[PDB]
Amino acid sequence: MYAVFQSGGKQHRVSEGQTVRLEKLDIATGETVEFAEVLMIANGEEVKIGVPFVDGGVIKAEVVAHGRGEKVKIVKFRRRKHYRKQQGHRQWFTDVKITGISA
Template identity: 65%
Template sequence: MYAVIVSGGKQYRVAEGETLKLEKLEVATGNTIEFDRVLLVAAGDDVKIGAPVVEGAKVSAEVVSHGRAKKVTIVKFNRRKHHRKQMGHRQWFTEVKITGINAG
């Protein structure tokens, strides 16, 4: 059984027992969170597609940790001007473990 959820403006395909990194959520480590914006639920040949969401479907997950991703380097360069600027960015994320999928 798997589902497609929306979190942080992005869509994720999740299955029970899976661990994934989402955009930062303001939830303490160890707490449970429920995603009610479920776009699709599939169990074998039985597929429910929402318009836009599947009514009554929920995906529950446990917050494992918070952290920052690897650094992305941004380089800005102007030719012939002896100008170079280098910056970096590390995006915050929340790591969650999917504990259950309720098809509704």
């Protein structure tokens, strides 16, 4: 059974069995993550929603890796005006593995 949840301002789609990527936790591997900020549970058919991020039912997960991303480069440039500059960024993350969704 498929479901949608909130991790931060990043919004997250998931099924049962799925590995998903989210915003940095202080949490490390070997711990359990859970989101009760689940907005609905649906399969082919989206339910009726009275309160925002319904408190009924859970998404159980566990951390499987906390690390830091590899280095992408961002180029800042403007023609004719002779402007050229360069930046890097990596960003941290936490990967979670969904161990089950309620019914």
